[PDB]
């Protein structure tokens, strides 16, 4: 009970409002002077921000509520001065007057009349005086009004002007972090008409300042991670002009708009190429912007810079397209030879040497398939030009020993032994190419096509391989010759190669595998347009698959090629078109969900996942839709790989318990693919979950399913002591982990774990937040989806080139014009800052520091020193020019 000795305000400011109705009555003195004497006190007490229990509002609300109710409506003589004063002095108390149900009462006073500028006494207060309740009103009442009646009265026009002035106020009161709440209103005001917010905020920041935009840009760019698809596109496109209109940096526009090539719009990518040719006037701003345009986003861009300045202003296209690729190969050779790379290691297979005494004696392995797996190990580990001269003659004797399929695989191993070669890899292949053996010739052609894979230059587009293709006399000597071509022009959507490979499937050859490989090649050649390929494929499916009910090689090549030909589009119209095209029997309806999900590569849509799990939920599936549930679980990892990393962990929580514990066929068999696709870093959570349910094969279940778990065991690159587990599993792999059923699987896994010290990275994530391409092939490789018995034979042709979207490991390089500088930086853990007012420490653990061109590593952020000014991109690109500028005397 504190009242007395000071509450004179509850005396005089109580009698004045009490006779204020009399002021509105016959006595105009109360109508003018009393209104002024109340408004001045209210403005004074809400002006200062020192006492957060306002001494005037809190002594009036009880009587003031009814006073305001019975004063304004019962005046009937609203002169400009008296009505303006009444509205001004009855609009402010409402925040204290009413409770949460106030959306219907933000305008009961303020809308009555606009007294001057409502921000005049609401100018320098940050989030106290009026902008809080004003922001709430404009957030909710405007949205309710504009839900369907967008074109209306002041609720659109004058509300727009109020929003503009309130954004100005948010900027001008304190210019504090509340600016990051100005976008809130921008996205809450004209929710649907977001454009007329985003443009407004762009212009408002145009005359704001050229340095206070970066924080707003980051806030918007990390708010775009998940929202409505159309809202996503609008926010991205409105972010695009921000680094150009207010600020004139215009250097990150070429990097943060390639992300909007496929996902946003094809014409968006057209305008991005337009702005990339309109810009790049500075020679520095061209060689760097072209570095990532080929080897970090996609191919098929070697002809867009061929204008009438093709001496050096347009000769850069050929440089960054292929000549930069050759220079990068030479660099990745020289540096590797400098640091860590002996010529012929071939030791990891021989690493199982301490086991010689263990378990008695040796001389147990005589399997012919073993020689195949050994060759594949010797190929995969020998990448990055780890050529073995006359040490591959073992593969020649094995090629002359047995396993014609193993002979083909061993022949194709030379493709990835000499990878990304242009000088003499084809020359090396040619000597063994003319060997008068069908399998040998097919393997030679596959290796030749692999050698130039990813280069997509005009060296030998169809010179050698297609001459044999047009001579498809043998059944076996016809698939790979075309299939490699699909890989060779994977990034190229050239219609010439598309219509040239269409005749492979139009030849009506008896080999259904040939048709499947042609479908795969046509799927992996183009990922966007050319619906005519889709029409031809669907017609071939109707004319062929109707009469057959065989293995899913149909479902492994036709619907996969269809999804690849229309991959990565959230329009869903193509999904509906293909859906209504192929309404048919359930064995064909297996492809319905496949084509539905292939067009949902990554986005935030809990509706999509909800129907994805509701579709193959339980259903008891008495041998009915096992393939449907298999693709549902294999794809549940997709659409979730860019959820802002919350979705990844939550999904791992769901998959760890739900399908693993209460599963019958989708769980016991196709539940390791989702882990094998979720991440490729190598962490204790998944590396523990996998072996516990995997090293114990659980022969009661389809024990071959455990074999699948072995393969995704090697889903982590970057060799580590994980081997120590699988090495032990090797010994228990003698009796258990059936040799004739899992020996080659364990051996290939152990070869993949420590496969290529350089170029180990293979995760389709160039840039912090980009995954433009490279998932194409990686999807077909993992598309074995069980049926490992079929894989045993198909892989000898397929597994050699099944995953061929590998990028080199290293990202740290000076990349000078002559590669002069070596290194001066500090690699560390990932970012440790998001929205901090204080200095932003990206490097959590700066302790680690190296001064060589050495490897980057996955969880590593790099920062520089010694004042080099690193003016290229400042983060990491493996090809930054990093010119020096030190105007600091």
């Amino acid at each position: 009970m504190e009242e007395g000795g000071r509450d004179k305000a509850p005396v005089q400011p109580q009698q004045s409002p009490a006779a204020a109705p009399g002021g509105t009555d016959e006595k105009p003195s109360g109508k003018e002077r009393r209104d002024a004497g109340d408004k001045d006190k209210e403005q004074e007490l809400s002006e200062e921000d020192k006492q957060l229990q306002d001494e005037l509002e809190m002594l009036v609300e009880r009587l003031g509520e009814k006073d305001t109710s019975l004063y304004r409506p019962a005046l009937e003589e609203l002169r400009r001065q008296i009505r303006s004063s009444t509205t001004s002095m009855t609009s402010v108390p409402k925040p204290l007057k009413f409770l949460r149900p106030h959306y219907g009462k933000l305008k009961e006073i303020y809308e009555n009349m606009a007294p001057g500028e409502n921000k005049r006494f609401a100018a320098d207060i940050i989030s106290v005086l009026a902008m809080t309740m004003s922001g709430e009103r404009e957030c909710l009442k405007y949205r309710l009004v504009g839900s369907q009646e967008e074109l209306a009265s002041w609720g659109h026009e004058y509300v727009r002007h109020l929003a503009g002035e309130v954004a100005k106020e948010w900027q001008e009161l304190d210019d504090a972090e509340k600016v990051q709440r100005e976008p809130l209103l921008t996205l809450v005001k004209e929710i649907v008409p977001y454009n007329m917010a985003h443009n407004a905020e762009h212009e408002a920041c145009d005359l704001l300042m050229e340095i206070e935009q970066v924080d707003m840009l980051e806030k918007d760019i990390d708010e775009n991670a998940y929202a409505k698809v159309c809202l996503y596109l609008t926010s991205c496109v409105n972010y695009v002009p921000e680094p150009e209109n207010s600020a004139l940096l215009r250097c990150a526009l070429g990097v943060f708009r390639k992300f909007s090539r496929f996902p946003e719009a094809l014409r968006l990518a057209l305008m991005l190429n337009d702005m990339e040719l309109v810009e790049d006037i500075f020679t520095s701003c061209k060689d760097v912007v072209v570095q990532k345009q080929m080897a970090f986003m996609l191919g098929r861009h070697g002809v867009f810079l061929e204008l009438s300045e093709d001496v050096e202003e347009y000769e850069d296209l050929t440089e960054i397209m292929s000549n930069v690729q050759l220079n990068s190969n030479f660099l990745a050779l020289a540096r590797e030879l400098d640091i860590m790379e002996p010529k012929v290691p071939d030791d990891i297979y021989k690493t199982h040497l301490e086991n010689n005494r263990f378990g008695g004696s040796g001389s147990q392995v005589d399997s012919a398939r073993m020689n195949l797996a050994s060759s594949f190990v010797n190929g995969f580990v020998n990448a990055a030009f780890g050529q073995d001269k006359l040490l591959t003659d073992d593969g020649n004797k094995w090629l002359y020993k047995n396993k014609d399929h193993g002979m083909l695989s061993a022949a194709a191993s030379l493709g990835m032994i000499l990878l990304w070669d242009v000088d003499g890899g084809l020359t090396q292949i040619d000597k063994y190419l003319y060997s008068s053996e069908d399998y040998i010739k097919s393997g030679a052609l596959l290796a030749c096509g692999i050698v130039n894979s990813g280069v997509r230059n005009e060296c030998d587009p169809a010179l050698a391989l297609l001459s044999d293709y047009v001579l498809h006399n043998s059944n076996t000597m016809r698939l790979g010759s075309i299939f490699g071509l699909g890989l060779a022009y994977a990034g190229s959507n050239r219609e010439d190669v598309l219509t040239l490979l269409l005749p492979v499937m139009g030849d009506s050859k008896s080999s259904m595998e040939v048709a499947g490989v042609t479908a795969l090649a046509c799927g992996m050649i183009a990922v966007g347009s050319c619906n005519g390929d889709v029409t031809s494929t669907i017609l071939q499916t109707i004319m062929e698959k109707s009469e057959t009910e065989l293995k899913d090689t149909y479902a492994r090549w036709l619907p996969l090629g269809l999804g690849l030909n229309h991959l990565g589009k959230g329009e869903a119209i193509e999904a509906i078109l293909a859906a209504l095209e192929v309404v048919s029997e359930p064995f064909r309806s297996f492809a319905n969900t496949l084509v539905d999900v292939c067009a949902y590569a990554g986005s935030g849509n809990v509706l999509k996942v909800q129907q994805l799990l509701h579709i193959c939920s339980e259903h008891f599936d008495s041998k009915e839709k096992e393939e449907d549930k298999d693709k549902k679980e294999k794809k549940d990892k997709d659409k979730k790989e860019a959820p802002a990393d919350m979705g990844a962990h939550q999904g791992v929580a769901v998959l760890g318990i739900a399908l693993i514990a209460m599963g019958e066929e989708i769980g016991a068999e196709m539940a390791l693919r989702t882990f094998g696709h979720l991440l490729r870093y190598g962490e204790p959570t998944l590396r523990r979950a996998v072996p516990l349910a995997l090293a114990l094969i659980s022969v009661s279940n389809p024990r071959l399913n455990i074999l699948d778990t072995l393969s995704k065991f090697s889903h982590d690159a970057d060799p580590e002591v994980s081997y120590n587990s699988i090495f032990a599993m090797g010994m228990v792999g003698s009796g258990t982990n059936n040799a004739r059923l899992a020996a080659m699987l364990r051996q290939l896994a152990q070869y993949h774990a420590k496969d290529p010290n350089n170029l180990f990275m293979v995760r389709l994530a160039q840039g912090l937040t980009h995954l433009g391409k490279g998932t194409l092939t990686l999807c077909p490789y993992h598309s074995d989806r069980q049926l490992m018995s079929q894989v045993a034979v198909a892989g000898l042709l397929t597994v050699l080139v099944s995953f061929l979207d590998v990028r080199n490991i290293i990202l740290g390089k000076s990349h000078y014009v002559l590669y002069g500088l070596v290194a001066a930086m500090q690699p560390r853990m990932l970012v440790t800052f998001d929205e901090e007012l204080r200095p932003l420490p990206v490097s959590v653990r700066v302790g680690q520091a190296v001064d060589v061109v050495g490897q980057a590593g996955k969880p590593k952020t790099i920062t520089g020193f010694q004042t080099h000014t690193t003016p290229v991109l400042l983060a990491h690109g493996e090809r930054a020019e990093l010119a020096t500028e030190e105007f600091l005397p």
């Binding site: 409505k228 809990v606 509706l607 909800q610 509701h614």
Partner: protein
């Protein structure tokens, strides 16, 4: 007396999420289409009632007639 049939088959799917806003746009997909695709689909009305007025209150009975 009728033999009748009945099954459960399914469990409810009240998956309340951000879907709650999609339902606003989805109905527009019908507004732009159901007004143009068809207009002339209907069934008769009020003929199902004309049975009850013909209440046959002069019920006929044969020769050996049960009666309560």
């Amino acid at each position: 007396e009728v033999p009748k049939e009945k099954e459960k088959e399914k469990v409810s799917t009240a998956v309340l999420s951000i879907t709650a806003k999609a339902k606003k746009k989805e109905k527009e997909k019908e507004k732009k289409e159901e007004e143009k695709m068809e207009v002339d689909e209907a069934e008769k009305k009020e003929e199902k009632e004309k049975k009850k007025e013909p209440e046959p209150n002069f019920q006929l009975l044969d020769n050996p007639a049960r009666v309560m």
